[PDB]
Amino acid sequence: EVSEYCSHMIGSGHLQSLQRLIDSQMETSCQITFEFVDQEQLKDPVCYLKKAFLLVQDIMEDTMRFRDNTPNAIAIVQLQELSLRLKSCFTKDYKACVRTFYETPLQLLEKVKNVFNETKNLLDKDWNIFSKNCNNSFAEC
Amino acid sequence: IPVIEPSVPELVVKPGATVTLRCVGNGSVEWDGPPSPHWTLYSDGSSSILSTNNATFQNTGTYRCTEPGDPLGGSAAIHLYVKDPARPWNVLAQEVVVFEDQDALLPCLLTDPVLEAGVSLVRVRGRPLMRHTNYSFSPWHGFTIHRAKFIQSQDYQCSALMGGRKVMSISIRLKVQKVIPGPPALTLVPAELVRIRAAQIVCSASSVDVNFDVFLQHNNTKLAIPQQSDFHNNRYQKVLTLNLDVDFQHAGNYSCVASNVQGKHSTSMFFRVVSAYLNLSSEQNLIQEVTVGEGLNLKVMVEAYPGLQGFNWTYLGPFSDHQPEKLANATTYRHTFTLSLPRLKPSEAGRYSFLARNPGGWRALTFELTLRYPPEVSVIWTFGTLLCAASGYPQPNVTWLQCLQVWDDPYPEVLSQEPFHKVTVQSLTYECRAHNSVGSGSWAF
């Protein structure tokens, strides 16, 4: 269903909500375990984001949980609706090729923010970037 | 209401079984149900019969009988389960589309009603239902998600509890759509514009969805303007900003047009190119004649660019120079300036000048206000000849009365014709009456 509206989709307002959510979080040394794409196996910027975008979905449901009707909770919902819209921009075929992490919640938030931010950057340059077959890229894993 | 035999809410059969559904009404009746093979249909006047010799899993579903031509008759229903093994679910559709706040039926038909107590709705890959998912289950129909939300647009699975293990149906994709009322909401400003040979025009459109176009076109040739895009207050914005650091070739009909899956919407404005201007006009004649005691409003229309740096009303009237203040105005490139002159006194006759000034220079419009003249009569005897005068504007007549006799004198031999005075006439007891459009006059000698 991919379209020229793959850009204009990740607004700055989205990134602000993420930043505010990040800024609200208490700086603590505690680490949380989560599944995410390994930068080593995927040096390719375009195929890294492709694999990451899929994983961010599970992260926001499982990890990024907030009290109902709180500003952060609403922000998460919007980011999730955003991700549904970002679907049909990413072409995909057949898991794995990923690694377990053990980082602070703030570091997790920075990863997710980076995923959304860099995806916006690339789509501004060209909205049809993430429609490439990374099956070959997903082989070297 | 029509009657179905067997009188049972549901049936459970094996693949290969023979199923015969019979419906009876007063008038003709007809069956509706799952589009499925091997169905034979027998129908006459009052009854109708569905029947198959090789029942298959595709035959699973609700079969409803209605009597057309009976209005408000109602319907009768029966549900068929064809338990094709191992296989608790007969999914009718792997895709469902609804709008937000609608019920969303996921048509997974349970092949065995006793299983109902141990069924649930889940997502693929074992994930749990989204938070605050309101839903219920009906054996004949499947799971209904109540008041569906965009966030719930997911791939679902129906879970059946059989011998401890949960057995999944094939996936069912749910599409929940935002209710998009119409084309993108436009905001083109300013609605009016006029400059001397800077300006700014911003074309904007906003919808809850991102999938919409917006373009700003000069005349019918669209301009290539990079659009700024942002998401706020749960809405997408797309803004085309035109900056002209201007000339005659830039003037014209800028149309702001946005489209989507709904349709196309358009709004527009006009852009004019003049240097700085200042034009003064009046719907009124500059020469004014009113009767003493009457009210008058002197109105000037001012079309100016840039904004006026000063304006006033001045009495050049000969009568003592009491100056206006009186002056009111309505409408910013257009203005109307009104000098109110209620119950005019005789010292208020004369010249009133309206002046306006801006970077383009200054302009003035001068009104001449004459008050009504009533006929004024002067009769003298000269050498045997009497001589009457009568006076006013407009040009009068004269009624002589010996009071016995009358001579009348409509447009006499003229004494004074000059701009801005009384129109003087000369007529060669003798009551000499004077009448113009203004009034009555007389004198006796």
Curated annotation (Swiss-Prot), chain A:
Glycosylation site list: N117, N135
Top-rank taxon, per record: Eukaryota
Disulphide-bonded residues: C6-C89, C47-C134, C97-C141
Protein name: Macrophage colony-stimulating factor 1 43 kDa subunit
Native source species: Homo sapiens (Human)
Residues of the full protein shown: 34 to 178 of 554
From Swiss-Prot, chain B:
Extracellular side: 1-445
Tissue: Expressed in bone marrow and in differentiated blood mononuclear cells.
Paired cysteines (S-S): C23-C65, C108-C158, C203-C256, C388-C432
Modifications after synthesis and translation: Autophosphorylated in response to CSF1 or IL34 binding.
Residue ranges annotated for the Ig-like C2-type domain, each copy included: 2-85, 88-178, 184-268, 276-372, 375-445
Expression triggers: Up-regulated by glucocorticoids.
Cellular compartments annotated: Cell membrane
Glycosylation sites: N26, N54, N134, N219, N253, N279, N312, N329, N397
Family of this protein: Belongs to the protein kinase superfamily. Tyr protein kinase family. CSF-1/PDGF receptor subfamily.
Disease: Aberrant expression of CSF1 or CSF1R can promote cancer cell proliferation, invasion and formation of metastases. Overexpression of CSF1 or CSF1R is observed in a significant percentage of breast, ovarian, prostate, and endometrial cancers. Aberrant expression of CSF1 or CSF1R may play a role in inflammatory diseases, such as rheumatoid arthritis, glomerulonephritis, atherosclerosis, and allograft rejection.
Notes concerning its domains: The juxtamembrane domain functions as autoinhibitory region. Phosphorylation of tyrosine residues in this region leads to a conformation change and activation of the kinase.
Physiological role: Tyrosine-protein kinase that acts as a cell-surface receptor for CSF1 and IL34 and plays an essential role in the regulation of survival, proliferation and differentiation of hematopoietic precursor cells, especially mononuclear phagocytes, such as macrophages and monocytes. Promotes the release of pro-inflammatory chemokines in response to IL34 and CSF1, and thereby plays an important role in innate immunity and in inflammatory processes.
Subunit relationships: Interacts with INPPL1/SHIP2 and THOC5. Monomer. Homodimer. Interacts with CSF1 and IL34. Interaction with dimeric CSF1 or IL34 leads to receptor homodimerization. Interacts (tyrosine phosphorylated) with PLCG2 (via SH2 domain). Interacts (tyrosine phosphorylated) with PIK3R1 (via SH2 domain). Interacts (tyrosine phosphorylated) with FYN, YES1 and SRC (via SH2 domain). Interacts (tyrosine phosphorylated) with CBL, GRB2 and SLA2.
Protein name from the UniProt record: Macrophage colony-stimulating factor 1 receptor
Native species: Homo sapiens (Human)
Upper lineage: Eukaryota, Metazoa, Chordata, Craniata, Vertebrata
Gene name of this polypeptide: CSF1R
Location of this fragment in the whole protein: 20 to 498 of 972
